[PDB]
Design an enzyme around this catalytic site. Structure first.
Site, PDB file in Angstrom:
ATOM      1  N   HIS A  41       0.840  -1.220   0.000  1.00  0.00           N
ATOM      2  CA  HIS A  41       0.000   0.000   0.000  1.00  0.00           C
ATOM      3  C   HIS A  41       0.870   1.263   0.000  1.00  0.00           C
ATOM      4  CE1 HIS A  41      -0.371  -0.055   4.615  1.00  0.00           C
ATOM      5  NE2 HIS A  41       0.061   1.153   4.318  1.00  0.00           N
ATOM      6  N   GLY A 143       2.484   6.649   9.405  1.00  0.00           N
ATOM      7  CA  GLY A 143       3.918   6.553   9.104  1.00  0.00           C
ATOM      8  C   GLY A 143       4.539   5.276   9.659  1.00  0.00           C
ATOM      9  N   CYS A 145       3.570   2.088   9.293  1.00  0.00           N
ATOM     10  CA  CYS A 145       3.404   0.880   8.487  1.00  0.00           C
ATOM     11  C   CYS A 145       4.785   0.423   8.028  1.00  0.00           C
ATOM     12  CB  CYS A 145       2.468   1.103   7.311  1.00  0.00           C
ATOM     13  SG  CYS A 145       0.759   1.380   7.836  1.00  0.00           S
TER      14      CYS A 145
END
Ligand code: K1Y
Ligand code: K1Y
EC number: 3.4.19.12
Lengths: 304, 304
Positions: A41, A143, A145
């Site tokens: 993603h 932020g 991930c």
């Protein structure tokens, strides 16, 4: 003496964290040998996340669109591929700090350490468990991930988790390092409700053994039970069924303390039925379920 | 979202840990520049620890009696000195992994991370607070002495604790890195009873702000209080007096949430008087006091 929620030392993993940017999205990547692993993603806008077609979005991306920074040094991306829900970015430089590692897919009830990171920079380390509903209860801001979960066996890092998603209920979902989500979750901003967050019974029993070893003994009683009788009480209290496999795993703690597993189950049964009556165990007013039997042994023996 | 008991990433400190052996005693040392810091009781037998005369014991020790091993490489000891309750071993090699560092002496209620080590090898990392009675509630087995506590500000490690002692009650005592014990404790195996382990009120209030930010709000009520009225209740419950300095420190959390500090004090007063009624806050059934206001801000903002 003393028993703490303890994470693995994080240095070996700190040496692997990088920043990955694609367009306006920045998150964290894991740099092992000459591959950087990150959530797929990274290629989405927040608009994209409502209904992403990852194969179609990825067609518009080239190697030079994946900006990978290790500290303040840029890495050259010479290939990329999608594996399940992770991207693998092939770089031209092996990470010189690559530790011995494995990728493992953990079972619910297993614990691991998370190195929370932002922009490739480590912020904190804490201990998690894979919940029985395949969520984790983490601490993750925008932020974070691509932050990872891991166990260490002497000098080998077993990576088991990469952070992808926060559910509308504020619990967390992610993947193994092959990019397969734990549980039914998907990398789409959509209705995803978690199932029952049941208590990990074998871990509670381990922790009660930890408590006895470290001198907290008030909850020991004159009773025993059977697996079937205990399990009637577990079911009522949304505890996981205790199996003979779990009893076997608690054998070393039973042996060390001289408290038969079924006697500790009878202590746990009374604590479920009677509550704590305003008392504490190892500084907790509830029954802690994020230590495994192996965690209790390791912490109680001083393994490095 | 989510709020966890989070330690600092430990890599910068892992790179400083060494093994120190004197005769039959092995513990941990901290290697910064060309000095290794360790507890002075490395020179004691367990017999010695009953009534040690450290100046007299040290006269019988030479540089070559202090065996310092960094991984599997021996360091050459070219001098030694005693500073309060620590030994400084001068080695012929600067630690190449020395981070930017400071020595700080923390105040009760301040939190830090501990890197528990055995034989110079890191085992785990966890978050501690200096209790108001100058003990810490750690996880330390035989061999863990010389393990350190620290805070990190970006790239600077502030070392604040070195582990020396377990009290007969299984709580922990140690020194700053100048070798001065926190509180009244001494490096002698003798009667040392801890005073009242009072609750760190400003930290509980910070954590209630953390709870509101992360969506746990059930305990918010229609009431306010004053510092003096709150303090009558704090005293009754063995909470630290709340001062205007504490109110000032909670200003940013007040501002962020729009809940006046005295309104949160009235929530805390009701929780003290009424208990939790079997409810939880950020996964705890008791009021957590080992997050400082700065910890809550840092974790809630994602500082690296
Ligand atoms: C399916 O896409 C690729 O195999 N792309 C390329 S091109 C190259 C020179 N390497 C890769 C590669 C190799 C390992 C991991 C990820 C990428
Ligand atoms: C009071 O004893 C010393 O100063 N001993 C020596 S002799 C030497 C060559 N260095 C030291 C030394 C220097 C800094 C820290 C500890 C020891």
């Amino acid at each position: 003496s003393g028993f703490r929620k303890m994470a693995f030392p994080s240095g070996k993993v700190e040496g692997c964290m990088v920043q990955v940017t694609c367009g306006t999205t920045t998150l964290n990547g894991l740099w092992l040998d000459d591959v950087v692993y990150c959530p797929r993603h990274v290629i989405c806008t927040s608009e994209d996340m409502l209904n992403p077609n990852y194969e179609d979005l990825l067609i518009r991306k080239s190697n030079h669109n994946f900006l990978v920074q290790a500290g303040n040094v840029q890495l050259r991306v010479i290939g990329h591929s999608m594996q399940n829900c992770v991207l693998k970015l092939k770089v031209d430089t092996a990470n010189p700090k690559t530790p011995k590692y494995k990728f493992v897919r953990i079972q619910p009830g297993q614990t691991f350490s998370v190195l929370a990171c932002y922009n490739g920079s480590p912020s904190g380390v804490y201990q998690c468990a894979m919940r029985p509903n395949f969520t984790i209860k983490g601490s993750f801001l925008n932020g974070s991930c691509g932050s990872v979960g891991f166990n260490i066996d002497y000098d080998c890092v077993s990576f088991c988790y990469m952070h992808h998603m926060e559910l509308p209920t504020g619990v967390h979902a992610g993947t193994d390092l092959e990019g397969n989500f734990y549980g039914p979750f998907v990398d789409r901003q959509t209705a995803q409700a978690a199932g029952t967050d049941t208590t990990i019974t074998v871990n509670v029993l381990a922790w009660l053994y930890a408590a006895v070893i470290n001198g907290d003994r008030w909850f020991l009683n004159r009773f025993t039970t059977t697996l079937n009788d205990f399990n009637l009480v577990a079911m009522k209290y949304n505890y996981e069924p205790l199996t003979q496999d779990h009893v076997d795993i608690l054998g070393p703690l039973s042996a060390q303390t001289g408290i038969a597993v079924l006697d500790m189950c009878a202590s746990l049964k009374e604590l479920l039925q009677n509550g704590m009556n305003g008392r504490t165990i190892l500084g907790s007013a509830l029954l802690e379920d994020e230590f495994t039997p192996f965690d209790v042994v390791r912490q109680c023996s001083g393994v490095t």
